[PDB]
Amino acid sequence: KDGYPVDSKGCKLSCVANNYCDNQCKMKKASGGHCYAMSCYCEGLPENAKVSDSATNICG
Numbered sequence: 001k002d003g004y005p006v007d008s009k010g011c012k013l014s015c016v017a018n019n020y021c022d023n024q025c026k027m028k029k030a031s032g033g034h035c036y037a038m039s040c041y042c043e044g045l046p047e048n049a050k051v052s053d054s055a056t057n058i059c060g
Contacts, residue, residue, distance in 0.1 A: 002032065002043040003051030011059040012052055015040035 004012045005028060015021045015035030025033025025042030032043025037055060045051060 001045050001047055001049065001051075002030075002041065003045060003049065003053065004039050004041050004055075005045070005049060005051045006057065009059065010050070010052070011057045013040040014038050 005024065006012055013024070015038060018034045021033035021035050021040040021042065023033070024040060025031070025045070028042055028049060029046050030042030030044045032041070034041060039055065042049070042051075
């Protein structure tokens with residue numbers, strides 16, 4: 001599946017470059033890792049990946 005990976009709190013990962021996400025997503029059995037709207041997004045994550053379902057999370 002695809003989506004935005006979160007952190008230990010469940011907040012979207014603030015990405016700043018494609019290479020950064022490209023490497024992260026990869027480690028997460030993903031294939032399309034890019035930085036969109038300062039948010040990392042991997043395409044091909046595992047059905048049990050920990051990503052959000054919206055372009056905004058509930059961080060502090």
